[PDB]
Design a binder for this molecule. Sequence first.
Ligand code: HEM
Length: 291
Amino acid sequence: LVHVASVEKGRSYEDFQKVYNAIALKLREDDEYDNYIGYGPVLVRLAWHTSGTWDKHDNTGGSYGGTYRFKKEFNDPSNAGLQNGFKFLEPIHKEFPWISSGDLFSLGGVTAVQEMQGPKIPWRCGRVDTPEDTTPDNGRLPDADKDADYVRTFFQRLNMNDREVVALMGAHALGKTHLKRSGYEGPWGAANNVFTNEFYLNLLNEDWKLEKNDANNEQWDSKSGYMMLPTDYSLIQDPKYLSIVKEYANDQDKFFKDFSKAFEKLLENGITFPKDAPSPFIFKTLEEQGL
Ligand code: HEM
């Protein structure tokens, strides 16, 4: 199936900047969530999980149809906790009922990255809601207890190469694992609602110990109180991933640029943009607008 982007009728960059801004203002206001981490990280994860069901082989899943709104997908065990991001976005959608669900979930992620002082992420509109029966089955999102070979093979289905995978994984600077959600517990670093390359620095520089958490799962833990999932740790066990980790640990701008590309790509898999579609939008942050 071909999913052609269709601009919400009559809308242009200013309409979407208003949606951006409403997301960004609520991110600022609703600051208590998750022990004052705020909603930035879970919105980034919502954008990723709503996009990461894509299968390049048959164009099933992906961000286009906004299918997370249907119970099979919002109740995917892999999506446990993302209901908080959805609930956050509900008043946004009520204010701007014209935006499609896929456009709102993906825009939430862009807005979160940028408001957390991350790179600009160009964003294109035009996702169109598709019906309940287009919701992908559970099981397309990745397991965390696996090795580098798993990770590499997993991401081939999303058409991501080694550099794109290592870049995307840098989002694990953000937020934390929650035991009751994923069976893993702890943050990956100190700056977990500011977008930086800390994930790579911690992988290389902390003294990690392989421990069992209280759900009986193995994770890597440091004396600073940080953790890495087995799939995170695989990025320094595999020599190809390791090189790239070192690159991003040593060049913040490079990480920003590569993350931006990979994240836009993730959010756009599966969508065909007509030749005469608008160019991608680059939203101004609240700070840049003086808001
Ligand atoms: C091999 C791939 C990946 C695996 C196995 C994985 C696994 C996990 C797990 C287990 C959690 C913790 C969920 C919880 O307990 O709340 C998590 C959190 C998160 N992941 Fe991933 N992840 C992967 C890739 C990504 C990518 C590609 C991104 C986005 C670019 C991403 C962004 C996030 C964010 C932002 C959080 C924190 C959520 C929060 O604090 O609520 N992850 N991930």
